[PDB]
Amino acid sequence: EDMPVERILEAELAVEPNDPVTNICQAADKQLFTLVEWAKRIPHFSELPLDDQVILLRAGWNELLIASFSHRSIAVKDGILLATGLHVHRNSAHSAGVGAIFDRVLTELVSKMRDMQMDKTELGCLRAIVLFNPDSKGLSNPAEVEALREKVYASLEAYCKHKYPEQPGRFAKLLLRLPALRSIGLKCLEHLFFFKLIGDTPIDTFLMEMLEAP
């Protein structure tokens, strides 16, 4: 109840305007600030207690950001477009030692989005579902977070079927990229923790903070 897809699309339109690994880390930090504003624009999000708001963002920021730049990379050839306006080509990522994860992103996310022509309203809802992760540990009221997630995909399914009547399986197809996003999200994090350990590759304050405990 009260989870209009129009508001979700607005949040998206509101935020969306040499070592390839270093450029990626900088883009991630830059986007972390934009992620918070985006979240505040998501219905009922800011109404949750500040603490659960922190738990939800710290728990999904990576999947949220990955989903965003991936959808933003549909038109791109073999690579991704960073929020900084930089392009990371598949070969460049390979020459940096992160080719494997980069390929999964292009194969399981970017390409799949481009193939089904996932629109911005759909991207938004998926990110909204990720944001509202009822499994996030520490939640003062997981049941409430769960209720919000259900209102989101309920509206998403409504959006679909209505805009894509000829594709009765589109709703499930969108939801079925989450397992891949979750898997790719976990691998990118492992790499990040390694980059921090090694000391090389600059990491800004906000990104660094996300690597803090828990």
Partner: peptide, 11 residues
């Protein structure tokens, strides 16, 4: 903890 995050969420 999470200095930056809290400050941004609160504003």
């Amino acid at each position: 903890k999470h200095k930056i995050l809290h400050r941004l969420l609160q504003d």
